[PDB]
Ligand binder design. Structure first.
Ligand code: T1C
Ligand code: MG
Ligand code: MG
Ligand code: MG
Ligand code: MG
Ligand code: MG
Ligand code: MG
Ligand code: MG
Lengths: 304, 584, 101, 37, 105, 132, 192, 67, 122
RNA sequence: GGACCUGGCGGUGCUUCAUAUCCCUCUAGAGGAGCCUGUUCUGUAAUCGAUAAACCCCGAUCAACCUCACCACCUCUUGCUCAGCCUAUAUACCGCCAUCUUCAGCAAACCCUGAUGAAGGCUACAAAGUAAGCGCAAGUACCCACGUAAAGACGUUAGGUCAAGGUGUAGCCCAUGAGGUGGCAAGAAAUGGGCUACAUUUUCUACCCCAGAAACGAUAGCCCUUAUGAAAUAAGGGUCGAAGGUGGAUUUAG
């Protein structure tokens, strides 16, 4: 469209004008630098990242307007026009034909992605039948051409990894070896320093565990990682702690010592204690009272 | 000063002046409302106190008959109230002091027994911009007359000056200055003689007023008035008063009134200036510039003093000293335009660009005249690339081009044969509001249809000519119902033929028949060439018929071309033969 | 020209409290100090209880700068609940969001 | 104070530099009420 | 209080109750009649204010123009009768709407 | 139901602007503020009189540019430089426009006692974000 | 109307010249088709020529990096240099002993009276006093709530007089008369 | 934040040392105790200037005498 | 370029720290860039810091007459950005500080600046 | 009267469910005692409004005077106002909300079906439905994508407010408007919600969880002092040392 063409012209000229006002008057002003330049030029301060200003090629801004499907004869271009779903039915016809001629010889796309590639609205059962035929074609022994068909329809996965990030060993102090990790639970913070050898000693805010933790439940919480990894009296710790309470501080310490001992124990056992549940933060935090209630979830008296 | 919205930009100098005077209207309009109701704006909120933002009180707060009330009414410049209550004090028998009687006669002599004008005076330059090329000698006789108050015999100033007991130098000085300001020159001279008899001293302003009065006196020769001016300066030296810049500038204004015989006295005056040691001003140079530049002088050696002037004046920064320092630049480019000197034009444009000297352009009309003449001269003798560079540098940032310039802007392009720039300057002119200027329209149409051009230039010309025809059609019912010029019709018709807009060309052949305008033989011959291309015998017979209807002496050759070039039927052949028989 | 009579009644209260603040201030301190004799105060008492009952800073009701509503005013903007709601919900009061914590 | 505010609005409306739709209503309604009341 | 005033769009929404009028005015006309230079009278540069006769005559013209305005509201429209007045049975709706297929009825 | 600044849905023929369309829960999530004055931050004194003057400006300029203010104004306030940026339509004559600019330009300066500046922004027709 | 100065404007045209001062957007001046606003379902973010959202943005158009650089060519005129007082805090402590807090609270609108802008507090080191032996005990016992023990700093605060310069005077006067009363030996120092 | 706002060059000894305006009575009296109390209050006043401090003093002086 | 070098030795400003309070972090960090590059070409030593945001949340009623259980809650986001200048000159002060002060943003801008000027005892 | 269309209902059928709701279940309470605070009733010369869910520590994030519109008594007339009115109607309304909603529908414009009736429009191995727009969803706030917030249309209930303010209609302007001064907020009784208890996982003291000792309960009442205020409600001490023995039916919340 002439709209699209002049919008393009205007972006190009305005992009060059954008590098002038900044300082990158050399011709190559990238899209990241464009976002950088408009950020500063006019400060946003709006929570929606679409409600802020923008300067992209009209291509991404304006949507995909489908071309005319018939010339000046009437006479629509695609042969499956009067289905109203030319692209989808042409694809289904093609996939059926490759299944047929293959039988004579012898993750998956989401619905929105398929609709984007076809530029046509689609029913969920239409998507389901397309996926079913495509699975019929991979299950059937197909050739390299129909392999590139299945692979232009299949997309990426982006697998993550769940191995605990091991802290480096800081061979420091005078000549000792330690790891300095962190932990947090219920507004409590604990930075912990664990030396590889030392046969047992904690210095929670300057004093030992029997002084900072008079409660045996707190002492059990401090035992927990060692007694799991069978290294009870074989390392020694020193911990600084702020905020929270008598159990939140102990939990933050427990997490910090586990996340520091990871460097001193093997990778199979750090996986084992992650499975045991000593290497994950506890997201349980206090909720908020609501206007018109008598607590976070607690309500008042009579409502029915 | 103008807003950045494309609807609110002025397109012309007249529109810009209209917008500025409308804004100034809104300003004295808010001043009137706020001073009429000061109670609604007495609450100050800003710290510190901004006395230029608190409202002004114009009503006299002292109602008792007292000299403090006289001082209040003089400070409020209420002439009638001050006169009436001075009469009240005289009736009460209270002796009014010499200083406040002096302030009262100061007010009376400044205002000429009238109240100050309620309009802040920004009128009397309302001349139309269509008469800037004829009769600056009758324009002087009707433009040198501000309708000021003539000094009436037996006014309130004379009554006070007779009534008060002890006459002093300040009172006599103010009386002489007021008489000179209100054109009582002979009375001012007689009062100066009375001052000399009474053994008082006149100050610098009074002596300058006396110089102006002696010159403005009627029926005396320039030699006699010059001798009188020399006598007044001798009296100044004898009274030990030191002359100054405004004294000598008044002398220079007067010798500018004294024309060719006063050229050497101007040089003597400037030499005595530099000898006594007072720096001449831009108004001084404006005065001797406008003296030496007079129409009808066959020598132009009087116009060589402009190069003497600039040779003294490069590189210097100036401060305001005299009222005509803003007229200096306008006068000198009048000289630069008159003598056609690009190097001196550039020289004083440089003197303008030195520091803050741009300020000494002054008002908008002077600015428009200055930049108009500068751009005329740039178009007249500069090379076309630096003319267009000055065009984009000056327009519309510095000034709005006048109607005449448009024509000239073209003549330079026609000389340089850079006719490709015609559509853009046409678009600029239409943006600046020159759409309804018939002389411009005619000029771009001839320069545009003179020659055969490359086809992309031809089709751009077709768009421009289409919009010109659209404007001509879109002028309904103005008293200048300007009939379609035959030249413009012929040119637009040639251009639409050249770009291939043939059907439009046929329609305005119909417009030719409507407006009874004689078409040109070249336009005709192009119409037959188009009819040959289209293979249209009916169109060929149409243009032959129009030529016969206007009885043009080309019609026989056109008919012979129709027979030679088309396969024609017998009834059309008979009609063409009848048309040739009618023309024969 | 005041929104109501009650607003105009406080604008009068405000004014003559502000003008009659010094006299009251002086005698009152003299009241709650322990230096002058028990009887040397009975006199100052008269002056206060006799100083008019429209300047005592006990009758100042921080009402609404826009629409006289006594109860339900937020001091920082001198506005009632629903007027502050109207302006902050139409978006002409800077910084005021909707609390979503 | 409400007086400078509302009385300047009074005077500026009576000078015609201010058009308040509210006073236009009451003006018009009081006219159509004085027609009958 | 000017502060407690409101827009007219809002005053009428309440007056009509249809959810369950300033057009005859020039931009500077005042009761006092201080005819300005940017409004009403064009832009000689002289502030002035009309007299008691020009004001009364102009406002009399305005109130008469209102009266003729309520007349052009309170004319009568003529509806042709179909089978009876207050019926719909012989009422001719116009020609059918032109077809979007470049058509005409 | 919440009825604060929510223009309800008519029949699909109701022109409406970005500002009017967004509801108060989008007040700085999608809309932002129409008046930028500093008083509503943590430590400041005079925010009340800033708002009292704010509603005044909105109604003065509403009654002084009669029926030409397309959407509502942007009363920003940096230094003592109050600014009344506008989006006024293209119907009245420019000399009248410059007049009401000057009249306001000086009258709010003498009411509030500081530099007040109006930077109009003429627009052809009242804009439409969506038809409700 | 008029075809705008945006497409009249070309590249290599000076933007510090185009926008001198801080001013609201003016998209006709702006040669950038910048689009703002949550879009409609099948549409784009709103255009540039009429947005109020593009108006309400502070608009740092006036100050572009190159404008900063050229601005301060002139702004470079007005600065001397510091001496070799050294980045070493002990060196500047040796060279210039005391420290004073004297602040402004800039607001934005009609007035500049923020009374709390008269706060003046003074921090001084006894190891920079150097003339204090048993007279130090005097200073300490005299100032009760000050002299934290970990760092040897005395902090006297004045907010008792309306002006900042006479508050500075009150800090220096109280310092010197505290000093003189500390060096004033008094008759009851021995019966401790 | 203090442009203008001179207060006639108060300069630190008129504001808080009111001994020059104290007008000494016999100092051992409760009245003179009051003057110490009120003097320290006007010293710790930063909102009032020295001129309103001294008219506050003379109010009490006038009235204290009046009795 | 009027300079006017006058008489008395410098006031010796230590640690002129600007605390910038605002409603909008995007204006605050754009301001950070404007001041950081200005101090870079000024020669003056700047450092950055983020003093943590305070939310003033508060509750009002939603209905005009009754229904106290249905309430609205409004909040203020006050964010701070500290821009501390260390080892700067008295002349250096009212030219940089002045440039920034005049080129301050609107309602989302405060410039609380503490100055620690050094001096000799007396 | 006959026959239908649509909707509501059914102590209406089958199936699948609810999960803090439906039951069986789990934890802490209400209902029993005292106190605080609303409301009803009684009372008084003494406001008004809310009044099953969706009123009842509700307009009030708040009444000694003020507030205040109530009452008594006495005064004011172009009255802070080109007046005013807290006069009547929320069954004329704007405004801002409750409720279903702890929902998913509301739908312009077409098209088809019903012999061209009210109306209706389903079958993916598919039989007429296509759909812009609002709503859920999505995107945002807070610590995550989780949870909690916000959000939740059309309409329902002439549901709530002319008393927040504005306001149509009808009324008053010797009045129903304006001001000053002093009182109104008491329980033979009742009920809603909270607070504290009836102790031994308790009580007092240190400590802020390794002791000593006891083997109880008023934030009421009277007295003293203080705070603030012109003028005492609040606060501390003193004194005292109630009823009360973990509360039936029913019910609440998670
Ligand atoms: C007597 N009824 C027919 C009635 C009449 C009017 N108004 C009029 O007819 C008066 N019309 C005049 C003034 C003469 C023009 C009425 O205005 C009313 C009502 C009914 C009430 C009932 C109210 C009741 N409330 C107080 C508990 C109730 O049971 C409900 C409810 N949904 O819970 C109501 O509907 C009720 O609140 C209500 O709305 C009524 C009226 O408004
Ligand atoms: Mg009939
Ligand atoms: Mg709700
Ligand atoms: Mg009711
Ligand atoms: Mg009443
Ligand atoms: Mg909710
Ligand atoms: Mg949602
Ligand atoms: Mg009802």
């Amino acid at each position: 469209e002439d709209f699209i063409k002049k919008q393009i012209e205007e972006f190009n000229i305005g992009k060059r004008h954008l590098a002038n006002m900044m300082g990158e008057d050399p011709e190559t002003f990238t899209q990241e630098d464009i976002d950088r330049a408009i950020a500063y030029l006019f400060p946003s301060g709006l929570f929606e990242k679409r409600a802020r200003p923008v300067m992209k090629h009209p291509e991404q801004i304006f949507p995909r307007q489908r071309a005319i499907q018939w010339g000046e004869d009437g006479r629509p271009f695609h042969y499956l026009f009067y289905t109203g779903k030319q692209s989808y039915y042409s694809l289904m016809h093609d996939v059926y034909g490759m299944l047929l001629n293959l039988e004579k010889h012898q993750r998956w796309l989401i619905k929105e992605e398929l609709e984007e590639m076809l530029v046509e609205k689609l029913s969920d059962l239409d998507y389901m039948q397309f996926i079913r035929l495509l699975e019929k074609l991979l299950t059937s022994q197909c050739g390299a051409a129909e392999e590139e068909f299945v692979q232009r329809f299949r997309r990426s996965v982006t697998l993550e990894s769940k191995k605990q990030l091991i802290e480096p060993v800081q061979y420091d102090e005078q000549g000792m070896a330690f790891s300095k990790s962190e932990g947090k639970r219920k507004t409590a913070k604990a930075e912990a320093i664990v030396y590889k050898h030392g046969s047992g000693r904690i210095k929670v805010n300057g004093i030992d565990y029997q002084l900072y933790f008079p409660i045996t439940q707190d002492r059990e919480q401090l035992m927990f990682p060692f007694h799991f990894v069978d290294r009870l009296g074989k390392h020694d710790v020193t911990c600084t702690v702020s905020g929270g309470g008598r159990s939140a501080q102990a939990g933050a310490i427990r997490l910090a010592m586990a996340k520091a001992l990871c460097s001193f124990v093997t990778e199979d056992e750090v996986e084992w204690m992650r499975q045991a549940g000593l290497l994950t933060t506890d997201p349980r935090v206090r909720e908020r009272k609501k206007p018109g209630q008598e607590g976070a979830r607690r309500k008042f008296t009579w409502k029915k | 000063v103008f807003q950045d919205d494309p609807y609110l930009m002025p397109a012309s100098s007249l529109e810009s002046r209209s917008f500025l005077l409308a804004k100034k209207s809104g300003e004295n309009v808010a001043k009137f409302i706020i001073n009429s109701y000061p109670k609604y704006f007495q609450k100050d909120i800003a710290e510190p106190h901004i006395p230029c933002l608190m409202p002004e009180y114009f009503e006299p707060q002292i109602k008792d008959i007292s000299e403090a009330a006289l001082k209040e009414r003089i400070e409020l410049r209420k002439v009638k109230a001050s006169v009436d209550m001075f009469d009240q004090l005289l009736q009460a028998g209270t002796t009014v002091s010499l200083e406040t009687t002096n302030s009262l006669l100061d007010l009376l002599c400044y205002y000429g027994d009238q109240e100050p004008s309620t309009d802040y005076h920004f009128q009397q330059t309302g001349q139309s911009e269509a008469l800037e090329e004829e009769n600056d000698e009758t324009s002087r006789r009707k433009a040198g007359h501000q309708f000021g108050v003539t000094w009436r015999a037996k006014n309130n100033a004379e009554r006070i000056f007779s009534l008060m007991p002890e006459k002093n130098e300040h009172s006599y000085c103010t009386m002489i200055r007021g008489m000179v300001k209100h054109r009582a020159y002979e009375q001012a001279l007689n009062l100066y003689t009375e001052l000399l008899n009474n053994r008082l001293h006149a100050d610098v302003y009074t002596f300058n007023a006396l110089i102006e009065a002696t010159v403005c006196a009627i029926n005396e020769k320039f030699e006699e008035k010059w001798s009188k001016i020399l006598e007044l300066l001798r009296h100044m030296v004898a009274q030990k008063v030191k002359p100054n810049l405004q004294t000598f500038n008044t002398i220079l204004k007067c010798l500018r009134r004294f024309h060719v015989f006063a050229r050497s006295p101007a040089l003597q005056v400037l030499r005595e200036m530099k000898a006594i040691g007072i720096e001449p001003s831009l108004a001084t140079y404006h005065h001797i510039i406008r003296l030496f530049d007079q129409p009808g002088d066959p020598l132009k050696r009087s116009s060589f003093i402009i190069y003497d002037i600039m040779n003294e004046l490069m590189g210097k920064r100036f401060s305001p000293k005299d009222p005509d320092d803003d007229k200096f630049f306008q006068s000198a480019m009048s000289i630069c335009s008159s003598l056609r000197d690009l190097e001196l034009a550039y020289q004083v444009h440089g003197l303008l660009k030195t520091g803050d000297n741009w300020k000494f352009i002054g008002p908008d009309q002077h600015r428009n005249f200055y930049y108009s003449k500068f751009f005329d001269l740039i178009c007249l003798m500069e090379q076309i690339d630096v003319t267009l560079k000055w065009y984009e540098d000056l327009i519309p940032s510095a000034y709005f081009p006048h109607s005449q310039t448009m024509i000239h802007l073209l003549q330079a392009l026609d000389v340089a044969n850079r006719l490709e720039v015609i559509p853009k300057i046409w678009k600029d002119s239409k943006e600046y509001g020159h759409t309804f200027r018939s002389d411009l329209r005619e000029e771009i149409l001839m320069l545009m249809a003179r020659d055969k051009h490359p086809p992309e230039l031809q089709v751009a010309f077709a768009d421009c000519a289409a919009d010109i025809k659209s404007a001509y059609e879109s002028q309904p019912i103005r008293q200048t119902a300007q009939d379609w010029p035959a030249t413009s019709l012929n040119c637009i018709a040639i251009l639409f033929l050249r770009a291939g807009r043939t059907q439009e060309a046929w329609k305005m052949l119909g417009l030719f028949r409507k407006h009874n305008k004689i078409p040109r033989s070249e336009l005709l011959n192009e119409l037959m060439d188009s009819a040959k291309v289209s293979n249209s015998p009916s169109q060929a017979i149409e243009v032959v018929e129009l030529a016969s209807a206007f009885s043009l002496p080309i019609c026989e050759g056109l008919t012979q071309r129709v027979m030679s070039d088309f396969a024609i039927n017998q009834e059309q052949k008979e009609a063409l033969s009848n048309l040739t028989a009618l023309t024969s | 020209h005041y929104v109501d009579w009650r607003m105009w009644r406080d604008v009068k209260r405000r004014k003559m409290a502000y003008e009659y603040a010094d006299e009251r201030l002086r005698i009152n301190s003299l009241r709650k100090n322990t230096i002058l004799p028990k009887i040397l105060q009975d006199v100052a008492d008269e002056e206060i209880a006799a100083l008019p009952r429209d300047s005592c800073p006990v009758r100042i009701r921080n009402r609404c700068v826009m629409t006289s509503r006594p109860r339900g005013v937020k001091r920082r903007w001198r506005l009632s609940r629903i007027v502050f709601r109207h302006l902050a919900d139409h978006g002409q009061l800077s910084g005021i969001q909707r609390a979503t914590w | 104070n409400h007086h400078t505010y509302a009385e300047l609005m009074q005077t500026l409306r009576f000078l015609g530099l201010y058009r308040d739709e509210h006073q236009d209503f009451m003006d018009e309604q009081k006219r159509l009420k004085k027609l009958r009341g | 209080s000017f502060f407690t005033k409101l827009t007219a769009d809002e005053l009428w929404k309440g007056a009509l109750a249809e959810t369950g009028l300033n057009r005859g005015q020039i931009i500077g006309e005042g009761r006092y009649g201080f005819l300005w230079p940017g409004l009403n009278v064009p832009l000689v540069q002289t502030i002035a204010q009309r007299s008691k006769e020009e004001q009364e005559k102009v406002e009399a013209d305005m109130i008469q123009q209102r009266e003729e305005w309520d007349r052009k509201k309170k004319m009568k429209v003529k509806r042709e009768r179909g089978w009876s007045g207050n019926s719909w049975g012989g009422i001719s709706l116009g020609p059918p709407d032109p077809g979007p297929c470049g058509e005409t009825y | 139901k919440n009825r604060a600044a929510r223009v309800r849905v008519s029949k699909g023929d109701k022109p409406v602007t970005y500002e009017e369309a967004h509801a108060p829960h989008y007040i700085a999530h999608r809309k932002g503020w129409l008046s930028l004055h500093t008083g509503n931050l943590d430590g400041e004194d005079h925010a009340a009189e800033r708002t009292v003057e704010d509603v005044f400006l909105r109604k003065f300029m509403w009654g002084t540019f009669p029926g030409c203010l397309a959407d509502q104004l942007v009363l920003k306030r940096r230094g003592n430089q109050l600014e009344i940026c506008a989006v006024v339509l293209r119907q009245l004559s420019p000399h009248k426009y410059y007049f009401l600019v000057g009249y306001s330009e000086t009258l709010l300066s003498y009411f509030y006692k500081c530099p007040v500046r109006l930077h109009l922004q003429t627009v052809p027709s009242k804009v439409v974000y969506k038809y409700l | 109307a008029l075809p705008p100065r945006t497409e009249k404007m070309a590249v290599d045209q000076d933007w510090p010249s185009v926008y001198p001062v801080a001013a609201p957007f003016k998209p006709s001046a702006v040669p950038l088709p910048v689009r703002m606003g949550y879009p409609v379902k099948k549409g784009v973010p709103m255009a540039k020529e009429g947005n109020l959202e593009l108006l309400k943005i502070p608009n740092f158009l006036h100050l572009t990096p190159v404008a900063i650089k050229k601005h301060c060519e002139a702004l470079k005129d007005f600065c001397t240099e510091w001496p070799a007082a050294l980045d070493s805090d002990e060196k500047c402590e040796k060279h210039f002993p005391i420290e004073i807090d004297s602040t402004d609270y800039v607001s934005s609108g009609p007035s500049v009276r923020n009374p709390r802008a008269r706060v003046v507090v003074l921090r001084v080191k006894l190891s920079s006093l150097n003339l204090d032996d048993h007279a130090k005990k005097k200073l300490i016992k005299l100032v009760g709530e000050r002299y934290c023990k970990t760092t040897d700093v005395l902090t006297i605060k004045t907010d008792r007089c309306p002006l900042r310069r006479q508050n500075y005077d009150y800090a220096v006067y109280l310092l010197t008369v505290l000093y003189h009363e500390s060096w004033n030996t008094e008759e009851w120092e021995k019966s401790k | 934040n203090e442009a203008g706002f001179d207060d006639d060059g108060s300069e630190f000894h008129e504001h808080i040392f009111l001994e020059k305006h104290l007008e000494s009575f016999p100092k051992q009296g409760p009245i003179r105790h009051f003057m110490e109390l009120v003097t320290c209050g006007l010293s710790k006043n930063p909102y009032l200037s020295v001129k309103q401090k001294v008219e506050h003093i003379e109010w009490f002086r006038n009235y204290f005498n009046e009795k | 370029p009027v300079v006017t070098i006058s008489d008395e030795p410098d006031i010796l400003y230590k640690r002129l720290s600007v605390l910038v309070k605002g409603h909008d972090k995007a204006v605050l960090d754009s301001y950070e860039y404007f001041a950081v590059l200005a101090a870079k070409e000024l020669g003056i030593s700047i450092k950055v810091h983020e003093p943590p945001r305070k939310i003033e949340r508060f509750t009002l009623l939603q209905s005009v007459h009754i229904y106290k259980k249905h309430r609205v809650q409004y909040e203020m986001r006050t964010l701070y950005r500290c821009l501390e200048l260390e080892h700067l000159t008295g002349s250096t002060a009212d030219v940089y500080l002045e440039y920034i002060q005049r080129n301050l943003p609107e309602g989302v801008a405060m410039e609380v600046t503490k100055t620690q000027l050094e001096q000799l005892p007396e």
